[PDB]
Swiss-Prot record:
Stretch of the intact protein here: 110 to 326 of 326
Gene Ontology biological process terms from the UniProt entry: cell surface pattern recognition receptor signaling pathway; complement activation, lectin pathway; G protein-coupled receptor signaling pathway; host-mediated suppression of symbiont invasion; positive regulation of interleukin-8 production; positive regulation of opsonization; protein localization to cell surface; proteolysis
Keyword Cell membrane: yes
Region listing for A domain, in residue ranges: 6-45
Tissue-specificity statement: Peripheral blood leukocytes, monocytes and granulocytes. Also detected in spleen, lung, and thymus, may be due to the presence of tissue macrophages or trapped blood in these tissues. Not detected on lymphocytes.
Region (B domain): 46-134
Disulfide cross-links: C2-C30, C9-C37, C161-C174
Recorded domain comment: The fibrinogen C-terminal domain mediates calcium-dependent binding to carbohydrates and tethering to the cell surface in monocytes and granulocytes. The domain undergoes a conformational switch at pH under 6.2, and looses its carbohydrate-binding ability.
Bilayer topology: Peripheral membrane protein
UniProt record similarity statement: Belongs to the ficolin lectin family.
Protein name in UniProt: Ficolin-1
Gene name for this UniProt entry: FCN1
Region (P domain): 208-217
Domain Fibrinogen C-terminal: 1-217
UniProt source species: Homo sapiens (Human)
Length: 217
């Protein structure tokens, strides 16, 4: 129950769950949620809120879809903005982004803190210092931006970034990263509308794998 249950994947790691997989955690208001724990990468204890791997799931979705979450525990998913807010509300959480290209290269980026606000604040990103990683830094430029989807434009562009770049993100005008973009399978001719992390592979290369995950700082 909520009284003794784990709050996140680090609690689960501490209790001896050493394999990655789906486990029940209890959010701050006691709402139970099934989450994916990455117990392997970089010490383990990471709660995964976004996964792309094969293009099986459509990510070009509306506000309601991103709010509640969508996809599959067996594959690709977005955990949901209400869930991500709740998970990052208590304490301080570090963010790790893991990427794999189509050539087999693994790259990563790490940030010292990560929070998303509530729906009233349009799931605004509150991002701490870049730590490092082979992927470089394509998220700091998104700090303090609201989340936007195709049907709800909260970006700082005269354009509709989510529609123009075919994703959903804390778009500014418009992006350095676009991990909820189209699954375009490596090099693409269209500009900046793929699973792009521009500090590493630029605006015309879409990654094979994306994983976004959090753990107590
Ligand atoms: Ca706009």
């Amino acid at each position: 129950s909520c009284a003794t249950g784990p709050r996140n994947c680090k609690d689960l790691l501490d209790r001896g769950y050493f394999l990655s997989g789906w486990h029940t955690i209890y959010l701050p208001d006691c709402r139970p949620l099934t989450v994916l724990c990455d117990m392997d990468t970089d010490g383990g204890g990471w709660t995964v809120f976004q996964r792309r791997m094969d293009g099986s799931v459509d990510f070009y979705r509306d506000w309601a879809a991103y709010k509640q979450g969508f996809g599959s525990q067996l594959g690709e998913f977005w955990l949901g903005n209400d869930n991500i807010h709740a998970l990052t509300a208590q304490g301080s959480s570090e963010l790790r982004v893991d990427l794999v290209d189509f050539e087999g290269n693994h790259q990563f980026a790490k940030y010292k803190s990560f929070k998303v606000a509530d729906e009233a604040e349009k799931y605004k990103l509150v991002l701490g210092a870049f730590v490092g990683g082979s992927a470089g830094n394509s998220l700091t430029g998104h700090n303090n931006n609201f989340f936007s989807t195709k049907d709800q434009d909260n970006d700082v562009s005269s354009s509709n970034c989510a529609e123009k770049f075919q994703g959903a993100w804390w778009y500014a005008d418009c992006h350095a990263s676009n991990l909820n973009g189209l699954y375009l399978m490596g090099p693409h001719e269209s500009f900046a509308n793929g699973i792009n992390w521009s500090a590493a592979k630029g605006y015309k290369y879409s990654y094979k794998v994306s994983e976004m995950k959090v753990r107590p700082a």
